[PDB]
Amino acid sequence: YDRGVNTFSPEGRLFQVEYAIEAIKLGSTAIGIQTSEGVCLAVEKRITSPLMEPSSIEKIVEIDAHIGCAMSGLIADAKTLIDKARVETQNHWFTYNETMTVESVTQAVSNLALQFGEEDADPGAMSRPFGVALLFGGVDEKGPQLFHMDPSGTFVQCDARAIGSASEGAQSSLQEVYHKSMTLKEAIKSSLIILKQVMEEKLNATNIELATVQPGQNFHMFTKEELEEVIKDI
Amino acid sequence: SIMSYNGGAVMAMKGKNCVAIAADRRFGIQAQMVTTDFQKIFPMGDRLYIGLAGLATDVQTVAQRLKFRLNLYELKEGRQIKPYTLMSMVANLLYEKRFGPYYTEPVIAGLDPKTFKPFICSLDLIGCPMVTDDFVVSGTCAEQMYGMCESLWEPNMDPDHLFETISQAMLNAVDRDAVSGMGVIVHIIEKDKITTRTLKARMD
Amino acid sequence: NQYDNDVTVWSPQGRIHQIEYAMEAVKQGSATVGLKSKTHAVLVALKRAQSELAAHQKKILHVDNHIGISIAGLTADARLLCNFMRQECLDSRFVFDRPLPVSRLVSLIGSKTQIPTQRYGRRPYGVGLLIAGYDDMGPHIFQTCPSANYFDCRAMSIGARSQSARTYLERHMSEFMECNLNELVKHGLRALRETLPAEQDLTTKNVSIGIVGKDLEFTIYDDDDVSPFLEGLEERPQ
Amino acid sequence: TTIMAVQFDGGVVLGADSRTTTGSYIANRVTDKLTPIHDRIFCCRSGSAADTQAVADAVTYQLGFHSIELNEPPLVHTAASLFKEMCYRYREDLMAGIIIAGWDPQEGGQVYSVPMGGMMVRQSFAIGGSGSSYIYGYVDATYREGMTKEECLQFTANALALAMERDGSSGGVIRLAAIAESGVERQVLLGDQIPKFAVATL
Amino acid sequence: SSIGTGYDLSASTFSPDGRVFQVEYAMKAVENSSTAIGIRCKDGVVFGVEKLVLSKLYEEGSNKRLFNVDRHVGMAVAGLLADARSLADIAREEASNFRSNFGYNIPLKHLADRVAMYVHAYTLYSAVRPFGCSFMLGSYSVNDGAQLYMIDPSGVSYGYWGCAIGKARQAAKTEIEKLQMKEMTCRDIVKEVAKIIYIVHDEVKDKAFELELSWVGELTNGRHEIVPKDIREEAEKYAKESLKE
Amino acid sequence: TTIAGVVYKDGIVLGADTRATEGMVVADKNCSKIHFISPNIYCCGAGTAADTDMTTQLISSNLELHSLSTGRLPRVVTANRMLKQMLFRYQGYIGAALVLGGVDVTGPHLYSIYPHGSTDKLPYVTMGSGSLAAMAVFEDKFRPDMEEEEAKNLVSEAIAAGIFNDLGSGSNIDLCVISKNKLDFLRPYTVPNKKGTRLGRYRCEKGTTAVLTEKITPLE
Amino acid sequence: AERGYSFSLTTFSPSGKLVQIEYALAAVAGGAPSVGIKAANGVVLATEKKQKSILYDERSVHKVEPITKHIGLVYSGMGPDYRVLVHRARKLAQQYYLVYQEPIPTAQLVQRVASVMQEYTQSGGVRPFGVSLLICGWNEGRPYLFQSDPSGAYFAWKATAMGKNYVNGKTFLEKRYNEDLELEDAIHTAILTLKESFEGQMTEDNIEVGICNEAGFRRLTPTEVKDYLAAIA
Amino acid sequence: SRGSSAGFDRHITIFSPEGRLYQVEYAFKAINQGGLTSVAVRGKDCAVIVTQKKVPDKLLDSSTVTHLFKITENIGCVMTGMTADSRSQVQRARYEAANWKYKYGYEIPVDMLCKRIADISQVYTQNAEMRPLGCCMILIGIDEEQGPQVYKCDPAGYYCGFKATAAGVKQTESTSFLEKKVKKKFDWTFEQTVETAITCLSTVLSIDFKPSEIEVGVVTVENPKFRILTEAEIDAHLVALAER
């Protein structure tokens, strides 16, 4: 039985959007923590072979020098949104000579939400939702911010958030350990801990990626050694 | 003028059961000659040639697109093209650019591939066809060629006399034109064979 | 089940199921209430949070200096409509240099939202709106449905468990036209409150307020700017 | 060209010369410049022959379809409005001076002017064309409210005769047409039928 | 009279017995709607609408089912409301364009024909669905007279002396045929309209309701207007009192 | 170019000269300026030669389609309409000046058609550089309801006037006679012009032209 | 408002068949029969123009239509489709004439029309034509007879039959007909092969005949067909 | 075969396994849903249309209820079947006529009008996106040389000229009647034609109509303008039938 991509369920939801939400539950789990000292983003790489170069796995990217993004689900779909976000920030810089607020970027990417459909559309329009969940971590005038976005287009600010397969467990673990006065060190530490809890493989320096954004420092992806120094303090 | 930018001359002449077409060989840019072997006469099948004078670019381009359409014709249909039909084809091709025309005034000369009856014609830059029973000319020395052809052409000429006539006409007309010449080439075609000659000509 | 999947398909009983299913999307959203005096128009909305470590969803959006909205349903469709309304208002100020009449903005929303309920492969907007405004005819509260229908309300509430609010509002209609701002926002907050179990109640964390009036441009209050409104309510006990 | 239209009680009266020139040469010394738009609606043309012919045909087409679709005799004001629309929309590409006149069961006999700009105005009488310039005074001193049909006929005849006498782009024959509820009465004044005026001698 | 085996999923599909069921279903959506009537007399046309109130929270005059299509043309609808509004916009645009192109107020029969062709255009293809509404157009002029037309989801347009649409169609018509409207004036008619509405209303199944009334005639110099609060309440009183017999 | 047309008792006589000039040089001494439109309709052409050719051919084609569909013989009004609308659409950029004549169920009809798209229905018309001479002949010697030979004589006289008084015209005279039941496509009518006999023999004998290169190619 | 279905209505079956084309052919093999004979000096087309009442004016619609001055058409199958194809064929012929100033060769017309027919077996939202065509023509001295089917395929025939009982008509032709026949004899055997099916009295208004010699294509007058239907002349 | 179906051959205009078009036949059935019958007869010097005028309600302006339409001043038509479709097709016909005169300079012949409409309908027959029109058009008018003309077009795309035809419920029976009455060979005069049509319809439905139950269109050689008879003249034709 085939119906349109813009069909409502009797419950009042779009089948494709819901199925996309389902599609996220297979993605690598990711953790973001917001803190007055900065925002941290951590994600497991999920290497499926020793033959696969893990440095070619980036589930954390720089949107701009003050905004990073962690992605879960269908990475191929995520690349498009990432590029669109970067282009958006650069256009905003060009026009106004000032950086974008994290909420503005997030909103921009969220504008491509339900921009899919069959009839009455361009011949280069999307046929289906993006099967991807995003975590934007940034620093602006309102300080360190962290936002979460899903294929519904609904985006919301979060203090600490987990996306992916082990979303629920990791979120509970986060709730148990988060307070609005942690240090960045405590945040990173916690993230790596919960990540190790939910990851099926043994946590190591070439198995996850971690990035921070602090008010005094641009977006930074942690090196192997910098990761080792942290994993040391398990 | 645009037509005088490269110069050149093309002539066709009827005979008995034969036909002739000739052209000078000069390719120049205004006063300066670049080459002396420029082709202005193109085979469009056995016993059917087309002569193109005017802007060299459009000579080459019209020739090429003509060969394009002609090849398609000879493929779709199982036959070589008739002269009248080639004339109408060229006319169509030129009139397609009615408001941005190719700068060439083509001359067609050939024998009916079924019969042997000689056919000659010339066209506008926008493809107005003109058939005659004597001769046709096109080029920067049109008046000269007219002058020679009106005085030398006899009706029922044999291949040799058609040759001598068209050759003398071309030579003497071209030799009173600064941007035409640097050699003359003549194709005289009959039922059984085709004779191609280059004339001894002035090179100034 | 064969009259379920396309908006262009009437049911044998004179209904369109895609429109109704779309209407169901309004009920999935957190409740919101809107009421007017004779001078002011107030939206009160119960925000809503995923987990405790997530902020509460925005429910009130600014359209023009004299017009604001409260949303219920698909947030993407809400932002879509919001941008449409903003653009129409801007157009009106640009061309006529006067603010766009609320009823006309609403009519435009009706026209725009009706279109895809008649074209194949198109879907209705999955969002309900409450519109607060003020113009030459005073304060206004409007309600827009996914069916592309719209209503001029004296007060209204939409969203999950909004029937309670609807009842309360239906009781105190005769008071509203003469209330003062504080009392109006109070009534809105009570209407919003009746949409909750006895365990939970209003906070400066899960309530957004929006006011527009004869002496006040459309304004949004939340967090600590809501406290003056809440700290003035009767601790309704079970 | 000299065209003229006078409104009376029961309807209207149309008049035009018959000279069409290309330069100083007369391409047609016997032109029909009174063109039926409908059963009781005519137009007087002036300006580019191509333009006026094309526009008249288009208007005739549109008005025909319109009248069939309404199942009523079309209004003169409607034909005039159609001419107005075309002549105004393409004012930079058309050279046409039109006079729409006719009878109509709703508003009776009427005359409208649609000059080169594309404006439209109803008038008691209207003149147009190159020759019109020479008869403004005459037509202003000779006109009188409440003329009979035959009086209007003689009136237009005289005016056109004068214009044709003075204007080089005007001449040939005179074409008249009376329109009323009765119907269309066309006639042609030629040679000696054309009114003459005492020419200065000594 | 009920075939549903795929033969009723598209307006581009005939039933084996030569019917288009989508149009019939839209008509059925009209049948489930509150009743609206319109009646033509010798000096104009009057409209009456039974506007069911779904909530006391809705303001007086919300969800009007009476429209100004042109300054001389009024419109009364029944059925899916949003569709009715869209058709009202269409009618308005048609009238506007007619004025711009021809100079005068559009004749009612012509406006009817145009809008009806527009409606009919939606009963041919699978790409769109028929309009779930029927509507009446009323107008008055000294050069045309008083005119009243009705259009259904199929695109059919007819001229009437009296007409009704919605739930109680036939009952309303039976009540209407008792009137000699060809001799009465709009003034006398308003009362009778309100009366027929109050009769036809079912207070048991349908709760509270609001009465809409529209003038268009010689009394209004050809302008389609709303019935004044005075005449409206007068007619309502006449109706309520006539209801007790 | 001098083309003319006249209406007589039983139909229509069309006339044309046969000179085609490029500038002030005669290119063609025997140009055909009378074009087939339909079996009952013919058209003389002056102005831009290619434009008259293509216009007249296009209209002929569309009219053949039209009559093929209708099963009836084409009307002259139809040709006039098609021509004038096409020409008006192009705003004079198609330099076709035409004399259109034919016989219908409604009888004989003669139009003159100008490149801008204006037409005139007249008993006699002239177009071209030699049109004023021909028009003089007509205005002097035309009467209504002439007989065939008289009309042919008149038209040939007008075309001759053009030929001998206009540098744009010359050579032969073509006539086309169209009646309710006859079509006389006389081509040419009468050549009042001849090249003088050659006084000399400028014949070149074989070998008098020097040759640098030869190449014989046998065919089949 | 309307757009258009952009997918094929004609698709391959697992057996490898284009079902809609074969159903179209079924529609052809249910229509009135038609015969075509190429005869050295000419071509004959004939068909059963049997009405359904005396009320039908047989002097209004024809089955034997001219395409140009030298090409003719008949069909078997659905009428309206045939009419469309006739308009289209005429247009194609005229385009050819505008480009080449030479009457279109019969084979070329057949190829172009066949291309048009093929389009409607692959383009979106349409069914194939329910028509087989017989096309006669005179070009380059020789006479020509082609048949084009709904698939868009065409064949050159010396003689053939289509429509009802086309197989038996075909056999009848294979036996009771061959080359070196004058056009008259061909008309004779054509009316003869049509008579192998025409249930009822075959009158001069029950059948339509068209001929194509080197003088042009034309429809035979009812009088001429009567003279031929006198089993003589 | 013999009534077999495969795929969507009963939903859209594609071929059934025996090469039929079911949707077209369904359109033909859709014609009868109106419950009306129209008769068209051609005379020696005229052409006549007659149709039932069922007005079951006094709440209607009879003046607006008509299946007779003016396509041109000299071309009339009667429509049978779905009403809205009929008016659509009428508009299309009017447009094609006006456009014809505009392009070609002469009045369109009934032959070509009918052919045009039929050509248009064939498209609906061959494209899946739209369904045929449930209507049937019969045109009458005087041609310049062929005399009086009666033509008719189908939802199938068929069109033809007739001496007499009919459409609607009582179609086959009307055809039988008319084809019986044509063989007689009588002076097909104006009154003969009118009476023939009226009596055809009457006997086929059996009524002896009131002058308000039918409508009569007509066109003559002496008066080519399409004329719709007043109820008065209709009655004048009615009372003349109750004499012999």
From Swiss-Prot, chain B:
Induction: Up-regulated in asthenozoospermic sperm. One of its GO terms (cellular component) is cytoplasm. Its main location: cytoplasm. One of its GO terms (biological process) is proteasome-mediated ubiquitin-dependent protein catabolic process. The modification N-acetylserine is found at S1. The keyword Transmembrane does not apply. This is Proteasome subunit beta type-3. It comes from Homo sapiens (Human).
UniProtKB/Swiss-Prot annotation, chain C:
There is a cross-link at K112, K205 (Glycyl lysine isopeptide (Lys-Gly) (interchain with G-Cter in ubiquitin)). Disulfide bonds: none annotated. It is found in: Cytoplasm; Nucleus. Keywords: Acetylation, Cytoplasm, Glycoprotein, Immunity, Isopeptide bond, Nucleus, Phosphoprotein, Proteasome, Ubl conjugation. Induction: Induced in breast cancer tissue (at protein level). Up-regulated in liver tumor tissues. One of its GO terms (biological process) is negative regulation of inflammatory response to antigenic stimulus. This is Proteasome subunit alpha type-1. It comes from Homo sapiens. The gene is PSMA1.
UniProtKB/Swiss-Prot annotation, chain E:
This is Proteasome subunit alpha type-3. One of its GO terms (molecular function) is ubiquitin protein ligase binding. InterPro entries: Ntn_hydrolases_N, Proteasome_alpha, Proteasome_alpha-type, Proteasome_asu_N, Proteasome_sua/b. The modification Phosphoserine is found at S242. The modification N6-acetyllysine is found at K56, K205, K229. It comes from Homo sapiens (Human). Signal peptide: none annotated. GO terms for biological process: proteasome-mediated ubiquitin-dependent protein catabolic process. Belongs to the peptidase T1A family. GO terms for cellular component: cytoplasm; cytosol; extracellular exosome; nucleoplasm; nucleus; proteasome complex; proteasome core complex; proteasome core complex, alpha-subunit complex. The modification N-acetylserine is found at S1. Keywords: Acetylation, Cytoplasm, Host-virus interaction, Nucleus, Phosphoprotein, Proteasome. Induction: Down-regulated by antioxidants BO-653 and probucol. Up-regulated by bacterial lipopolysaccharides (LPS) and TNF. Component of the 20S core proteasome complex involved in the proteolytic degradation of most intracellular proteins. This complex plays numerous essential roles within the cell by associating with different regulatory particles. Associated with two 19S regulatory particles, forms the 26S proteasome and thus participates in the ATP-dependent degradation of ubiquitinated proteins. It is found in: Cytoplasm; Nucleus.
Curated annotation (Swiss-Prot), chain F:
It is found in: Cytoplasm; Nucleus. GO terms for biological process: proteasome-mediated ubiquitin-dependent protein catabolic process. The active site is at T1 (nucleophile). It comes from the Eukaryota. GO terms for molecular function: endopeptidase activity; threonine-type endopeptidase activity. Expressed at a low level in colonic mucosa. Up-regulated in colorectal cancer tissues. Its EC number is 3.4.25.1. It catalyses: Cleavage of peptide bonds with very broad specificity. The keyword Nucleus applies. Disulfide bonds: none annotated. One of its GO terms (cellular component) is proteasome complex. It is an enzyme of class 3 (hydrolase). Keywords: Cytoplasm, Host-virus interaction, Hydrolase, Nucleus, Protease, Proteasome, Threonine protease, Zymogen. Belongs to the peptidase T1B family. The 26S proteasome consists of a 20S proteasome core and two 19S regulatory subunits. The 20S proteasome core is a barrel-shaped complex made of 28 subunits that are arranged in four stacked rings. The two outer rings are each formed by seven alpha subunits, and the two inner rings are formed by seven beta subunits. The proteolytic activity is exerted by three beta-subunits PSMB5, PSMB6 and PSMB7. This is Proteasome subunit beta type-7. The lineage of its organism: Eukaryota, Metazoa, Chordata, Craniata, Vertebrata.
